[PDB]
């Protein structure tokens, strides 16, 4: 592709910043740009992502787990470290219209945050979980109010 030299330089700066960001930062920055594109650009990028992920078998296994309210509910029987691991790897795969699964994620979070905010442990994981919950289209305004108060307490 033939591009303006300034644009090439800016994309180079972008790549450097992106490599230095954590995954939460990367996701948030990308969302900050995807909110500004046209519906047609958004659909094109959606098609690109769908094409790239179409035959990702391991991803599909995680997605099914992430959308199974019974599976999610059972995670309360795991150690704190494992539940935080499960939430971080599965919450981004929750489908926006899966209300029953969403409810099970919202039931597990306040238990994990209390322990973390008390034993000053996994606070970053807790912060990454609250960030992902706050930007997840599945969460309601009432969910997001609760999520915000849990951030204030943290």
């Amino acid at each position: 592709l033939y591009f303006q030299s300034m644009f090439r330089d800016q994309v180079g700066v972008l790549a450097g910043w992106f490599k230095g960001w954590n995954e939460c930062e990367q996701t948030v920055a990308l969302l900050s740009l995807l909110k500004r594109v046209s519906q047609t650009q958004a659909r094109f990028l959606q098609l690109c992502l769908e094409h790239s992920l179409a035959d990702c078998a391991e991803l599909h296994v995680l997605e099914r787990e992430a959308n199974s309210p019974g599976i999610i509910n059972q995670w309360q029987q795991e150690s704190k470290d494992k539940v935080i691991s499960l939430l971080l790897t599965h919450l981004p795969l929750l489908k926006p219209g899966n209300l029953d699964a969403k409810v099970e994620y919202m039931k597990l979070l306040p238990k994990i945050l209390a322990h973390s905010i008390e034993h000053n442990q996994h606070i970053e994981e807790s912060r990454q979980l609250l960030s992902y919950a706050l930007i997840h289209p599945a969460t309601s305004l009432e969910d997001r109010s609760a999520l915000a108060m849990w951030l204030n307490h943290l």
Copy 2:
């Protein structure tokens, strides 16, 4: 909002996102799409799926978009566009090619027939050069195009750049 415990890092992240927003607002739609693709290729499968779900949610009930998508994936409709004025064909291709579904082979064949016709006219008459470059760029990054398609599209792009330089 909170992405780091480090207060210095949190403030610098916000600064960077601001600069990014300013750059993005000044980019044309082709630059924006290419810049976004240059980041999406770097994310994990899980990040990619999350962003995909967000896009799908935002677009789910976009009625006017859906009308354009149906046109963009109808080979008979696309084929008829060759009867339109060169200005209209350029406009139709710009607005519909990004909506072509990656496995719609028959629709893709019709785009690959129309693109050389509008590029030959643009090169001969020194018109629509920017739009032609954008159409070729979109086609070259389009998940629907094959490696053979992209060899042909690169041929056309080099010819356009050679004839306009």
